[model samples]
Target: THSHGLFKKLGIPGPTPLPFLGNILSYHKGFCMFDMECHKKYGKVWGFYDGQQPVLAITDPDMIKTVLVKECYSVFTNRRPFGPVGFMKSAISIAEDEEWKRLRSLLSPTFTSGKLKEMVPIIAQYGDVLVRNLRREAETGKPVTLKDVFGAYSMDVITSTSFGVNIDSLNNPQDPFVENTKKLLRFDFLDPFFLSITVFPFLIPILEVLNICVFPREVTNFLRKSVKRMKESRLEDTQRVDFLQLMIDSQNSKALSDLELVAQSIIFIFAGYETTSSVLSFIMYELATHPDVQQKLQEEIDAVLPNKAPPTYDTVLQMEYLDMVVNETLRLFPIAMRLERVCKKDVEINGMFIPKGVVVMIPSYALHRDPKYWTEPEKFLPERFSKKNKDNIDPYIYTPFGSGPRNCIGMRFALMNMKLALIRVLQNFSFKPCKETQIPLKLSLGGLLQPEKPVVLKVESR
Candidate 1:
């Protein structure tokens, strides 16, 4: 069980991890700065830890292109697996190889441009409601916390998509759907429950028998109950345009059990709540701080979308500057700093002899911010993603949604909804920093990268 010498044995550079805790304390402040600092010191590849588990962090784009993308089907099939997460164990993110294959296969077609087009009406409605409430914030003349505002909007979008149930969150953030999902997403890897299991993974099986869950039971129960009701209702008839209906549509194989069926429905809604909201918050915050950039983005929105013209899924994708802003926001604040895969067998990858059980970490934020790959790494310049300069950049280095076949399935869904909402907000209002705004945008790494302080700003009428 003693793997202290493993990194050295593999000739991988890393900080010396102490017993049990390993290099966990090294990341105590947060992961973004840690990954950045490590990349500077240790070069492209370095070893780190969460408790006793070793994570070999790599920012080497060439290796990622060849191994993670090209050779992905071989031994490098699954992301690190979690233990006994009930139905969540079967969620597409963690499901292994064949399970990953079938789930990915069945769900792939459901997220097509064709399939997502129908949901434009759903997103546009959510976007309009978001703007309507922002008008109230503009009327109040007080600092508005973008997280609270966008979180509710994102919750409504994702929940309606996932459950086919209308969730009115922006007008009233008091809804249990938004509240509980936010509670559920408030996770830290350093939590005692998660840490104990990380240091002593054998505890997982015993913990599983006792039915210990890492998530708040209230959130799970609420989602479970909600999904159950919808499933019951969904079975009654096939007429709908939400994620629940999509899953039911593609689930031709009896390979997915009833629990998996329910879990699949809830996972995306749960995921989109915070990830999408946080990015939207960052985008608004960045625009508030960078008025020049905001002006140009607004000009494009006006030209492409012209006032009173409803933006369609195809039409929103046309505002290339909005796409640039979205890409830049994600570049600055990548929610998932790491894209990881667990080894299924001992194999030699690009002259590095990696044994099985090792999780290969692609430090995405580090790659995005590394000055070698990006000039003026910390600046909020949307033009980095522009057509003229964007093509020169490599996909692996700027992979905000991750890269390869196992990348985020809901990227289109998340992108479309966020763009719709962003355009709607920007068209009607402009963001400007206020007294409560945290300049320099302090961030922290919890379950994802988040603002250390509230993204407080002023919402002004256009």
Candidate 2:
């Protein structure tokens, strides 16, 4: 076993950890904020541990670029493993080496600009459902929680896009698909079973031996069954633009097995659903809080999407201010607060030697709000992303979708969906802070950075 002083000998600074436990308690205390505080206390590059696992957290953009982009990318290809064993092996997000490359290549065409354009009408269809649901609430003059609302909106979009099935979650809030999706995302990292696995990862193999499943068996079974049904129903003779269609088409060429297809489909729904909804909810909160910014965004939307026509792909892309608002929202409250990549080979970066097996994390929440990166980091300043000033900001510092080859595969799709939802909802309604709205949003304690309470906002018809 390596000495716990390995990091100290390498001259890396970080909060000292107790033997065996390491910094797990500190990590659980404040979640992402703890890492940000650590970055402040130590230098940009520091080291901590997850149990005995040595984790090097880097906030330096240059070092991040070196680790994430320039060198050892192939070496650092895999993310820290979590979730079910089946999911870990099958999902592209955590798939390593050859499998990851194959899956990535096979799925890449589904998110092409042309394909994303085809998805616009699908997204807009659900966006209309979202607007109707919000409008109904607005008519009652009752404060509405945008997270659940947008979550249902996103669920509808992903369900339709990924499985070619429309659940219309906004209309039918109790849909089985919607309920199961909510269950899948209800990951409690602090749960005794999960927390133990996180702190001591080696327990994973033992649990697997015991037939432990990270996700509920029913959820996994449902997703697999849905994919099978969808595939069976769709005729190969007919061409379709949904993700599952693309996967089905590529099966022979890509040698994609049924398990692989089901894995990809499940991941598409899992990844696309929560992150997009959280960002949309956050965007609404920011716009509601900053009316000036909202008005400016509305004006920009009005210019391109005049006459309340459904926004075309070109129209949404041209609305630069809308992009800026989304960008700013992502910066302030990124869904993935941290990005992790495990060291695949021993490599020295910036005079610090990172041995193979060490986990390297980029505390994005810290880097995004770093005073060195932004003048007023905490303020909701969409202008920071304006064309004039956007060029001045560093790319490595503002990665809500991550960076490099391993970045979020659904980046363009997520952005396009967000833009479409904003266009449809903002055209018909405006968001305002109500009595129930949580001021200075408290983050929920979970894997993702979400509002602690329901993000309620007043929906006023425009």
Whose TM-score is greatest here? Answer: 2
Please count the clashing residue pairs in each candidate, in the order shown.
0, 0
Model 1 lDDT tens row, 1-462:
387788888788988888888877776667777888898899978997766677887676787875578778887788864544754777887687888888888788779999899999888887777878788989998989888889889888877777665767866668777777767474565566666677778888886778776556677777778777777776786456877777765555436666777677667866787888888988999898899989998888889988747899888878889999998998888888778888777887777887888888888888888999788988888888779997889888888888889899989988998999888888889888998887877786554588889789988897
- Best candidate per lDDT, number? 2
Residue pairs whose backbone atoms clash in candidate 1 = none
Model 2 clash tally? 0
The digit string of per-residue lDDT tens for model 2 on 243-301 reads: 88888778766478898888888788778777788889899999998999899888888
Q: What would the TM-scores of all predictions be? A: 0.95, 0.96
Each prediction's whole-model lDDT (CA): 0.80, 0.82
- List candidate 2 stretches off by more than 4 Å: 1-3, 236-239
Task: Output the TM-score of candidate 2.
Answer: 0.96
lDDT (Cα) of model 1:
0.80
